Design a protein around this ligand. Structure first.
Ligand code: CHL
Ligand code: CHL
Ligand code: CHL
Ligand code: CHL
Ligand code: CHL
Ligand code: CHL
Ligand code: CLA
Ligand code: CLA
Ligand SMILES: CC1=C[C@H](O)CC(C)(C)[C@H]1/C=C/C(C)=C/C=C/C(C)=C/C=C/C=C(C)/C=C/C=C(\C)CCC1=C(C)C[C@H](O)CC1(C)C
Ligand SMILES: CC1=C[C@H](O)CC(C)(C)[C@H]1/C=C/C(C)=C/C=C/C(C)=C/C=C/C=C(C)/C=C/C=C(\C)CCC1=C(C)C[C@H](O)CC1(C)C
Lengths: 158, 201, 225, 202
């Protein structure tokens, strides 16, 4: 009876957020919660692994199909080396972020929307972000190499 | 009076001619009636919409060239499966039927646990709850609805027996025989065909 | 994301209703005995693990015997030469080997099961399962026990184990297992002696039963004397 | 039951869902009918494997006028059944011997005629357990279980004989001939393809 959909964040109307079908829908919430970044109980290294694999896999494609050597027969090798170089740059960015970002105490805790007190993400720490960066590097290079393999292997690739 | 035709329903009374020893027979004849109801109706409708006998309808769909049954249904301008695709396949239909009817029979008769969670005791031929989307049993009289169904059950089984023995005598089909009997009642009956010899004598 | 934790209340698509035992109270009137129910007639019981080893070889040899049977019935190729079809080279042929297959493993043209592709999938799937079955890797299903040949949780979706008598079903499987292993041994020895497939040997033995036996082929030396 | 897993049940094991067990004489009748059916289905199995004649046509080979054809029908026989020169198994000869032997056995099975043996053999018992079982297989084996085996074979073979008679009436081809046609191509050789052909009448 005259249902209103959009509600404040966790019922508190004094926080800078609103819960909408884009934010708090069950399908959206389940998808995001199942992504590796939001698996806070898992080791940061393995989350970084999957992240790197996914990211390094796709990021190669723009360099393959739109790079300077896209017309040449070496288009794929150039694009994959470009992707590997970008993975190395992003590893540098991750290393510097991990060195600088986690310098404060952050005395305030974290809870779920149900109100359950939970521990902080080990990813959100200097050494945890270092492990995540290493996982990113391994995953990104493996994903770039896999993209090269698939461009050389996949039947309907052109 | 209720059920004054001949004899009495299994729910109340005794058979005039049989002892009714086993209580499995009651629900057996309910299921047999319902199947016959669908069978007789099928034989009624097929030979109207297609003109083929129900007993030779099986020959249309065979493991080779089952495409004959495609588009046989009245209206239904799209065939069962597109022409030239040859996808009306006796084995495909048979397997789909085996799995669907076998699962339905297992659910009904307790070979497998019922998938649902709402009552539905095995062996009752009047479940009601899940099998009344329209809610006609609670609105109407349950007992007399059940008696009507039984009358239909026995009527349709007798009609099916008549259909099979007509098929054996005249070799033509139920509706074509009905039309021949209607057109010339004196000159199209069982005794007339007996005077012709039933097609063998 | 909030914690729902509702009640699934799902039932099996098929869940066999209680059917109990369909065997006599005597369970191994055949030669020998099931493990844990008497003394081994001839060979010494090597180890407690040997019962589970027998079960695994049995199930694998069942699957192998049925595979050789169906492959020779559907293609006519003997099982011992079916390996030569899918190779690092020309594994395209292995595709269309299933009678009635709506589609080929190898679509017409280049599209095809590669040996290395098939192999890499085979290692990654079968080895994973093999490890998960045994103490290797870990246990992804804690509710089941690694090292038990009869887990009977998710591995009996139809629930025949609980629907009937469990131990009679177990011995039934064991008897089928031993039968199929001995039949598999017969198949390999027949392949060695006659160089023709199992169903080919069967057909030769049923067309003229009196000839086309061990001793008939021995009269020709099994093509070696 | 545990032992009897077939659709129905054995008399004394319980009660059948359809036509439940009445008089014990019905159970005696079932066992004897089975026994003669096992013999009959086996005869219809072996005879046309030996010589190719369907059992429903094997009767007319012997006739009151001529019964030479039945002689030398058994495969592997060292000699003719009666002299090769003049076979003497005439239908009347067969009859006169067989009516006396079968009538004796029957009356002595049922005890309408005084038993010759009088070895304790009690008529109206399907399992005499006397000279009929010299091996005394029942003594070593488990008699309840063996009774169940006997009844399972009884019902199977009686059903097989019903199949033989109805296959004769539909296809008039012969039991093993019908088998060989079905093994040749079951998909295109079965009851329903013979129905499509019309069972030879339609
Ligand atoms: C139990 C359900 C059912 C019944 C009663 C029949 C009955 C019949 N079918 Mg059908 N069919 C049925 C289901 C199915 N049929 C077919 C496919 C066919 C084929 C392919 C053929 C038949 C034929 C026949 C007829 C002769 C066969 C026979 O057994 O009669 C024996 C006679 C008796 C009196 C029985 C005692 C008969 C009218 C045949 C036909 O049309 O011949 C004229 C034929 O060739 N049926 C399929 C597969 C989709 C079915 C699936 O359930
Ligand atoms: C709007 C579409 C359409 C129309 C006008 C008709 C019209 C008709 N159908 Mg058809 N049908 C139609 C679609 C379909 N019919 C069928 C299957 C049947 C059956 C099974 C039956 C009819 C019957 C009938 C008649 C009532 C009438 C001639 C019935 C009849 O009396 O046949 C003569 C009948 O029993 N139709 C299917 C399923 C494939 C359809 C799917 O689109
Ligand atoms: C009630 C007992 C009675 C019996 C047993 C018969 C039996 C018979 N009549 Mg008769 N009739 C009987 C009463 C009467 N008939 C007739 C008038 C006729 C006619 C006009 C004809 C017969 C014919 C027939 C035969 C075919 C019927 C059939 O298909 O059955 C078959 C049933 C079974 C095999 C099993 C059940 C059959 C021998 C017909 C025929 O042509 O005979 C050759 C025929 O044309 N009957 C009259 C009216 C006065 C009767 C009055 O009660
Ligand atoms: C959908 C249509 C289709 C049809 C009619 C058949 C028909 C057949 N297949 Mg094929 N198949 C079909 C699709 C497929 N088959 C296979 C893979 C197989 C295998 C692995 C086997 C068969 C077997 C068989 C036979 C089993 C008969 C019974 O039991 C029969 C000749 C069996 C066989 O060859 O028995 C000797 C068998 O073992 N088929 C695949 C891939 C998963 C299919 C996908 O579309
Ligand atoms: C258990 C005993 C017994 C049974 C069941 C049969 C059964 C048969 N005999 Mg055999 N016979 C038997 C004993 C004997 N026969 C013969 C000698 C013959 C001859 C000479 C003939 C038969 C024929 C027949 C058939 C008769 C079919 C019929 O009448 O229409 C169908 C009946 C029903 C469906 C019953 C309801 C059928 C296959 C006849 C036949 O088919 O010839 C081709 C035939 O001519 N039998 C002898 C004496 C040596 C027997 C001694 O006991
Ligand atoms: C040297 C003697 C001799 C040999 C080798 C055979 C061999 C055979 N007989 Mg014959 N018979 C012989 C003598 C006799 N047979 C018969 C009466 C039968 C019968 C009744 C049967 C055979 C059958 C058979 C076959 C067994 C196949 C299986 O098992 C086989 C061709 C059986 C058969 O037909 O199997 C195919 C069968 O049922 N024989 C009699 C008594 C008249 C014989 C008298 O000496
Ligand atoms: C002549 C043979 C014969 C006889 C005397 C019996 C007798 C019996 N059976 Mg057995 N049975 C038989 C054949 C026979 N059966 C066959 C062939 C099968 C396999 C299908 C079985 C399967 C069977 C089961 C599964 C069970 C029995 C049970 C019983 C008992 C129940 C009472 C009964 O039905 O008796 C009356 C005897 C009949 C044979 C019934 C009549 C059947 C009608 C007439 C249809 C037959 C059509 C006929 C063959 C048409 C031929 C036409 C052709 C000549 C042209 C009784 C002891 C039950 C029992 O003991 O429970 C405790 C039980 O559970 N029987
Ligand atoms: C590799 C499969 C295998 C395994 C692991 C077992 C293991 C077992 N069986 Mg089983 N069994 C098998 C095969 C096997 N059997 C087969 C095929 C049959 C049917 C013939 C049987 C029939 C059977 C019965 C009837 C009984 C057992 C029993 C047992 C147990 C006691 C025996 C023991 O521990 O020593 C196992 C030792 C061996 C398997 C070594 C034997 C090696 C010979 C020489 C065979 C080699 C095969 C072949 C020729 C190799 C070819 C090589 C190729 C290059 C050409 C144990 C659980 C008994 C039991 O449970 O006791 C309570 C029991 O009663 N089994
Ligand atoms: C639609 C269709 C199209 C295709 O082309 C072919 C196809 C075959 C697939 C077909 C499908 C058909 C289907 C699914 C049919 C289902 C049929 C069924 C279940 C029939 C049951 C038929 C039942 C009979 C005869 C009963 C006889 C019994 C009698 C008289 C006894 C009466 C009796 C008793 C009991 C008690 C009294 O006091 C006294 C008396 C003595 C009167
Ligand atoms: C061998 C040989 C060679 C020559 O060439 C020719 C030759 C003819 C001389 C020939 C000689 C053969 C001989 C002598 C044969 C003897 C045969 C015999 C004794 C047959 C008996 C046949 C018996 C039948 C059908 C029973 C049907 C009964 C049925 C279904 C009901 C079943 C039933 C029941 C009871 C209760 C449950 O609850 C459920 C259901 C309802 C299923």
């Amino acid at each position: 009876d005259k249902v209103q959909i959009v509600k404040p964040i966790n019922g508190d109307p004094f926080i800078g957020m609103l819960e909408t079908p884009v934010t708090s829908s069950p399908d959206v919430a389940n998808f995001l919660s199942n992504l590796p970044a939001y698996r806070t109980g898992v080791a940061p290294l393995l989350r970084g692994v999957e992240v790197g694999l996914a990211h390094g896999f796709f990021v190669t494609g723009p360099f393959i199909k739109l790079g300077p050597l896209r017309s040449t027969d070496a288009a794929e090798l150039a694009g994959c080396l470009s992707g590997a170089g970008l993975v190395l740059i992003l590893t540098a960015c991750l290393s510097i972020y991990g060195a600088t970002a986690f310098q404060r105490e952050e005395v305030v805790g974290l809870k779920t929307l149900s109100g359950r007190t939970i521990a902080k993400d080990p990813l959100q720490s200097s050494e945890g972000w270092a492990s995540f960066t290493s996982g990113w590097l391994v995953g990104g290079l493996s994903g770039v190499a896999w993209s090269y393999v698939l461009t050389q292997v996949l039947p309907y690739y052109s | 009076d209720i059920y004054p035709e001949f004899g009495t329903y299994p729910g109340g009374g005794e058979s005039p001619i049989i002892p009714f020893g086993s209580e499995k027979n009651a629900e057996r004849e309910v299921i047999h009636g319902r199947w016959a109801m669908l069978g007789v109706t099928g034989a009624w409708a097929a030979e109207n919409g297609t003109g083929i006998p129900w007993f030779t309808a099986g020959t249309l769909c065979t493991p080779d060239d089952c495409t004959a049954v495609a588009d046989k249904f009245p209206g239904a301008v799209a065939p069962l499966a597109p022409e030239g695709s040859g996808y009306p396949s006796f084995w495909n239909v048979l397997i789909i039927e085996i799995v669907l009817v076998g699962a339905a029979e297992a659910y009904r008769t307790g070979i497998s646990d019922s998938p649902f969670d709402d009552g539905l005791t095995v062996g009752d031929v009047n479940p009601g709850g899940r099998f009344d989307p329209l809610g006609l049993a609670e609105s109407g009289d349950l007992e007399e609805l059940k008696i009507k169904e039984l009358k239909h059950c026995r009527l349709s089984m007798f009609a099916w027996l008549g259909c099979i023995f007509q098929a054996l005598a005249t070799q033509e089909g139920p509706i074509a025989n009905w039309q021949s009997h209607v057109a010339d009642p004196v000159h199209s009956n069982v005794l007339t065909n007996a005077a012709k010899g039933f097609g063998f004598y | 994301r909030r914690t729902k934790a509702s009640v699934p209340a799902k039932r099996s698509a098929f869940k066999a209703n209680k059917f109990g035992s369909l065997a006599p109270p005597d369970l191994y009137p055949e030669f020998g005995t099931y493990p844990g129910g008497g003394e081994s007639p001839v060979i010494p019981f090597g180890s407690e693990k040997n019962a589970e080893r027998e079960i695994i070889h049995g199930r694998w040899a069942m699957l192998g015997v049925t595979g050789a049977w169906a492959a020779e019935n559907g293609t006519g190729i003997p099982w011992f030469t079916a390996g030569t079809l899918c190779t690092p080279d020309d594994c395209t042929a292995v595709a269309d080997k299933f009678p009635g297959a709506v589609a080929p493993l190898a679509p017409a043209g280049s599209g095809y099961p590669n040996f290395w592709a098939v192999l890499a999938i085979e290692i990654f799937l079968v080895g994973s399962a093999e490890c998960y079955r045994t103490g290797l890797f870990e246990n992804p299903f804690p509710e089941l026990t690694q090292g038990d040949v009869t887990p009977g949780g998710r591995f009996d979706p139809l629930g025949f184990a609980e629907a009937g008598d469990l131990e009679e079903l177990k011995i039934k499987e064991l008897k089928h297992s031993r039968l199929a292993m001995f039949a598999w041994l017969g198949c390999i020895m027949q392949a060695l002696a006659t160089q023709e497939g199992p169903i080919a040997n069967w057909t030769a033995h049923v067309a003229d039963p009196i000839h086309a036996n061990v001793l008939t082929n021995a009269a020709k030396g099994f093509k070696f004397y």
